[PDB]
A paper describes a structure:
Microtubules are hollow tubes made of parallel protofilaments formed by the head-to-tail assembly of αβ-tubulin heterodimers (tubulin). As a result, microtubules are polar structures, with a (−) end where α-tubulin subunits are exposed, and a faster growing (+) end, terminated by β-tubulin subunits. We present here the selection and characterization of αReps that target the tubulin α subunit. αReps are artificial proteins based on a consensus sequence of a HEAT-like repeated motif initially observed in thermophilic microorganisms (Guellouz et al., 2013, Urvoas et al., 2010). In this work, we have selected α-tubulin-specific αReps. These binders prevent tubulin self-association by targeting a surface that is involved in longitudinal interactions in tubulin assemblies, with different implications for the two microtubule ends.
The structure of tubulin-iiH5 was similarly determined to 3.2 Å resolution. There are three, virtually identical, complexes in the asymmetric unit (pairwise root-mean-square deviations (RMSD) ranging from 0.39 to 0.50 Å; approximately 1010 Cαs compared). In the crystal, tubulin-iiH5 formed a helical structure with six complexes per turn and a pitch of 54 Å (i.e., the width of one tubulin). Indeed, iiH5 makes a 1:1 assembly with tubulin. It binds to the (acidic) longitudinal surface of the α subunit. It interacts in particular with the T7 and the S8-H10 loops and with the S9 strand. iiH5 also interacts with the N-terminal H1-S2 loop. In addition, the iiH5 binding surface is basic and is mostly formed by residues at randomized positions. The titration of tubulin by iE5 led to a dissociation constant (KD) of 270 ± 75 nM, whereas the same experiment with iiH5 led to a KD of 95 ± 15 nM. The different binding modes also result in an overall surface area buried upon complex formation of about 1650 Å2 in the case of tubulin-iiH5 vs about 2470 Å2 in the case of tubulin-iE5. We calculated angles between the α and β subunits ranging from 10.7° to 12° for the three molecules of the asymmetric unit in the complex with iiH5.
Author numbering:
A (entry chain I): 13 to 166
B (entry chain F): 1 to 44, 47 to 360, 369 to 441
C (entry chain E): 2 to 279, 284 to 437
């Protein structure tokens, strides 16, 4: 409580390792006050701050993070994309099902895997419908994930 | 590489062998009934090297006591630690070699040898991973010499993958007035050059000189000489008995010490040299100990180290002392004496520090040297042999006991070859 | 995606448990393998699973194997504080050691245990989705460190072809020197492993002994003192492979960046700051110290050679602008000679995770640290020292009979030395 105000002002700070350490801290404690400042750190100049803000937003869970994380699946950095996909899987919001399906055709193995894992964690009915459609009208890795989900779910 | 099997042959072998047990049993915290009554955890860490854990908390020496003279059997058992030895491990004859090598190597000794091999086979079986063998004997008599070297050859042929190490006591006219001793010594040296991996040269001439010239022992007994031997055997085997890196096992020590298979005869040394029961006085420092390591007066073999070059050196410091002090003193002794160390063997001087000091001393140093100056020892025996053998004097005592004259010629050839070999490496340069 | 660590002989095994002590501390893993919510590192994303498999319990087990031809050293691992961390099948021991003889570790005694070790590695390889390769720890001077490593390296090339093999080698010193024949064992291992290793990081026992006395003020440094330091440097080298970092991520990135000629694969590592716990250093200071011969893992003069590669791995409180500024001064101010055909490019990596020190260790906790990896011609000085020592003893054929009696041919000594001569010529010729 008394320390949450501190790390929120360290997230703003000039020094990149200090900004990184502020985002690591706010994920370790996880207060509802840290949501909007960590949402701003998703658009940070440094990839090591962006990826740990994304991991923090997934741990805390707040719904306000669902939209900036959806845009974060399109981040230039492979680690930021994997951490954003996994965060959306932790939150489990059905608004993330289609952007996560688009991440199944990413150039990075970890990102593809992270998107597959996230979809499995959400596993509603809209996920199932999208998996059914992808199992029939889908290709390669993205098809394997649809087919594997429907076989892990009798 | 864990267990070591000990064999002690003849009069000298059993005397010096029993003093070794008396001393290391006290060091390891063992009483004459085989019960551990010590305090340090380190005393029992590598106890399985020289002892068997027969029954409960009880420890037994892995020792085989041999002699063709049955008198030795009672001497051992009536002694201080006589009750710890296995009763079945005493193999004694009813005859004697009468200081004849042929009697111990071919006649009376060869009759009893198979009974001894039965006992060595027994002890080799209750061994998890046998390192090797250790023989304590005299080269000047008939039993320790003839039967002892028959045993060495018989063990070498049975256990060839195992290390064969000896504590051989060299005859001297100063100590024994027996005439045929050069024959017994030359015939044994010939066996040792071929069938041992490491031989500690304990010269009775050096032992007498230390007692007479330095300890001021007016007319020393064997008890006075054996005090030097037991202290040396205690210090040279320290690495093998306590937890340590450098020369921990017989093979690891053999690798570091032996560059050439025939040049395996070591000049042992000790510091400080205290007379039997002469009240402990003046605490030595690391520099005083290091100086007494190189000092010819402190050598257990009658050779000047300054009359040769060192091929390899193993130094063992015992007690509570600075590692910085030992490292400093062993570095100076090499640089300020570079001429006495072989240039072509990089880092040939190996130092070791054991925190457990010996009985009665707060600090001690043991020296094991493979110096080319040990040819002086063999030259002395060859000169002694030649004077007699030229005339073929008393050869009938040996040839009558199923030996040949060519055996005498082969022994003489081998010992002269060994001396020439020591000379070649003494004269050898790195260039 | 995964790396297997092999720890051979006394040096390798002892270094391995010092490494693993630090890895656990770095990733927030307890000595039992548990990683609870209070001790979990915090900042999400973690790639430590390249080195630790995960059990159904939540227990993190090292993807490590420990081999020794005698039980003494691994018994200490089995009874130590980390007895719980490793599974019993990972720790392999014989009875009779190699007695500081290469031929015993490679032929006689090594041939007895090689097959079991391989099946134990196979158990680990079978738990890997995409095994990148191996990290091999061993000494040059021990019979097992030299002999068994080369025998295993030979067998891993056949059993695992397209798999990287990066070594961490204990280069001998006269200070911590348990054998006369260490130069023989060193030349023999380097000859037989050369065609099987992809990269080799040497640790010169004389350099670490010198660093402990100079930087940590230890009067007569013991194996405990040296090992805490080795593991600090080693962790900084392997950090790339265990963390979500951009430079030297997989074993291939390490080979690609650091090694341009195949035989010449011995990078010299430097590390700053090495402070005794008894004053804060900047990015400029720690970068500058990397180019100081006093701070090197191996004793050599880089001003006398040419570079083929130069990587700077920073960790902790390290700001991008400060790193750029520090590098810029080093380009303009220093006399760093690179070979013509390779570009004068300093590959930089920054991890903002604070440095983790050994509690009860001789090392102080610093804000920032740096580990430089340089592929220099100067490392031929380390080879020359060894080769001369070898030549002294070999000319008189001293100790050779111990090798020929343990399943080895004397010609393998001449063959070995010939390969070293070629390696020395290669470093000389490449640096014109
Ligand atoms: N830095 C470091 N060096 C060590 C350590 N243990 C041994 N050494 C060095 O390694 C060399 C000896 O080789 P070892 O690793 O002990 O031998 P080994 O692989 O167990 O082989 P064998 O002795 O034949 O059983 C010498 O240079 C020692 O100083 C250690 O824990 N750390
Ligand atoms: N130092 C020492 N030498 C001894 C001892 N007993 C005999 N010797 C020497 O050993 C040689 C004789 O060997 P000995 O053991 O009596 O004959 P064996 O019974 O036939 O082996 C002579 O050179 C003696 O000086 C002893 O207890 N100590
Ligand atoms: Mg070992």
């Amino acid at each position: 409580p008394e320390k949450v105000e501190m790390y929120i002002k360290n997230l703003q700070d000039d020094s990149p390792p200090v900004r990184f350490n502020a985002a690591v801290a706010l994920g370790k404690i996880g207060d509802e006050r840290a949501v909007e400042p960590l949402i701003k750190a998703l658009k940070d100049e440094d990839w090591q701050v962006r990826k740990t803000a994304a991991y923090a937003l997934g741990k805390i869970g707040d719904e306000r993070a669902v939209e900036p994380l959806i845009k974060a699946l399109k981040d230039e950095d492979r680690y930021v994309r994997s951490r954003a996909a996994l965060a959306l899987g932790k939150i489990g919001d059905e608004r993330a099902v289609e952007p996560l399906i688009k991440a199944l055709k990413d150039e990075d193995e970890y990102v593809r895997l992270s998107a597959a894992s996230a979809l499995g964690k959400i596993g509603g009915e809209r996920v199932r419908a999208a998996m059914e459609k992808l199992a029939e009208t889908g290709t390669g890795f993205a098809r394997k994930v649809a087919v594997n989900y429907l076989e892990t779910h009798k | 590489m864990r267990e070591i099997v000990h064999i002690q042959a003849g009069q000298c072998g059993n005397q010096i062998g029993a003093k070794f047990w008396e001393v290391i049993s006290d060091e390891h915290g063992i009483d004459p009934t085989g019960s551990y009554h010590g305090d340090s955890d380190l005393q029992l860490e590598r106890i399985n090297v020289y002892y068997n854990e027969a029954t409960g908390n009880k420890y037994v020496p892995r020792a085989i006591l041999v002699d063709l003279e049955p008198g030795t059997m009672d001497s051992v058992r009536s002694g201080p630690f006589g009750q710890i030895f296995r009763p079945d491990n005493f193999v004694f004859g009813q005859s004697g070699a009468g200081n004849n090598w042929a009697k111990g190597h071919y006649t009376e000794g060869a009759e009893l040898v198979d009974s001894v091999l039965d006992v060595v086979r027994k002890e080799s079986e209750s061994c998890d991973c046998l390192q090797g063998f250790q023989l304590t004997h005299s080269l000047g008599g008939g039993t320790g010499s003839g039967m002892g070297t028959l045993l060495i050859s018989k063990i070498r042929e049975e256990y060839p993958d195992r290390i064969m190490n000896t504590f051989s006591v060299m005859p001297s006219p100063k100590v024994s007035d027996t005439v045929v001793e050069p024959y017994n010594a030359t015939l044994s040296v010939h066996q040792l050059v071929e069938n041992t991996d490491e031989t500690y040269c304990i010269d009775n001439e050096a032992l007498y000189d230390i007692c007479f010239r330095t300890l001021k022992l007016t007319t020393p007994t064997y008890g006075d000489l054996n005090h030097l031997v037991s202290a040396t055997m205690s210090g040279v085997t320290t690495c093998l008995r306590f937890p340590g890196q450098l020369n921990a096992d017989l093979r690891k020590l053999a690798v570091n010490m032996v560059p050439f298979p025939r040049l395996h005869f070591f000049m042992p040394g000790f510091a400080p040299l205290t007379s039997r029961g002469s009240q402990q006085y003046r605490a030595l420092t690391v520099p005083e100990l290091t100086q007494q390591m190189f000092d010819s007066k402190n050598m257990m073999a009658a050779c000047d180290p300054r009359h040769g070059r060192y091929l390899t050196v193993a130094a063992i410091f015992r007690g509570r002392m600075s590692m910085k002090e030992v490292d400093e003193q062993m570095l100076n002794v090499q640089n300020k004496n570079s001429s006495y160390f072989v240039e072509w063997i990089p880092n040939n001087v190996k130092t070791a520090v054991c925190d457990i000091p010996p009985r009665g001393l707060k600090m001690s140093a043991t020296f094991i040297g493979n110096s080319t100056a040990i040819q002086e020892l063999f030259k002395r025996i060859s000169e002694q042999f030649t004077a007699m053998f030229r005339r073929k004097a008393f050869l009938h005592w040996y040839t009558g006991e199923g030996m040949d004259e060519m055996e005498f010629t082969e022994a003489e050839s081998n010992m002269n070859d060994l001396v020439s070999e020591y000379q070649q490496y003494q004269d050898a340069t790195a260039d | 995606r995964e790396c297997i660590s092999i720890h051979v002989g006394q040096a390798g095994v002892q270094i391995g448990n010092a490494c693993w002590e630090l890895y656990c501390l770095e990733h927030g893993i307890q000595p039992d393998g548990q990683m609870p919510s209070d001790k979990t590192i915090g900042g999400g994303d973690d790639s430590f699973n390249t080195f630790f498999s995960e059990t159904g319990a939540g227990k993190h087990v090292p993807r490590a194997v420990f081999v020794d031809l005698e039980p003494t050293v691994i018994d200490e691992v089995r009874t130590g504080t980390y007895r719980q961390l490793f599974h019993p099948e990972q720790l392999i021991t014989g009875k009779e050691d190699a007695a500081n003889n290469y031929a015993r570790g490679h032929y006689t005694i090594g041939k007895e245990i090689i097959d079991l070790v391989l099946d134990r590695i196979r158990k680990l390889a079978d738990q890997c989705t995409g095994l990148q390769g191996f990290l091999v720890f061993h000494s040059f001077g021990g019979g097992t460190g030299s002999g068994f490593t080369s025998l295993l390296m030979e067998r891993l090339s056949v059993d695992y072809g397209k798999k990287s093999k990066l070594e961490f080698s204990i280069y001998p010193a006269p200070q911590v020197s348990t054998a006369v024949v260490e130069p023989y064992n060193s030349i023999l291992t380097t000859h037989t492993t050369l065609e099987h290793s992809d990269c080799a990081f040497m640790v010169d026992n004389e350099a670490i002994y010198d660093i402990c006395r100079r930087n940590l003020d230890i009067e007569r440094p013991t194996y405990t003192n040296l090992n805490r330091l080795i593991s600090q440097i080693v962790s900084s080298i392997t950090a790339s492979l265990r963390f979500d970092g951009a430079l030297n991520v997989d074993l291939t990135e390490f080979q690609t960046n650091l090694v341009p000629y195949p035989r010449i694969h011995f990078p010299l590592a430097t590390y700053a700051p090495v402070i005794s716990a008894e004053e804060q250093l900047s990015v400029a200071e720690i970068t500058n110290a990397c180019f100081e011969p006093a701070n090197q893992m191996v004793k050599c003069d880089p001003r006398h050679g040419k570079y083929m590669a130069c990587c700077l791995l920073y960790r902790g409180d390290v700001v991008p602008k400060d790193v750029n500024a520090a590098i810029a001064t080093i380009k303009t101010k220093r006399s760093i000679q690179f070979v013509d055909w390779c570009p004068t490019g300093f590959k930089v990596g920054i991890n903002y995770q604070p440095p983790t020190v050994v509690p009860g260790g001789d090392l102080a906790k610093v804000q920032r640290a740096v580990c430089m990896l340089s592929n220099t011609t100067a490392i031929a000085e380390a080879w020359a020292r060894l080769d001369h020592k070898f030549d002294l003893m070999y000319a008189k054929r001293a100790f050779v009979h111990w090798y020929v009696g343990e399943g080895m041919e004397e010609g393998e000594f001449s063959e070995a030395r010939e390969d070293m001569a070629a390696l020395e010529k290669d470093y000389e010729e490449v640096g014109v």
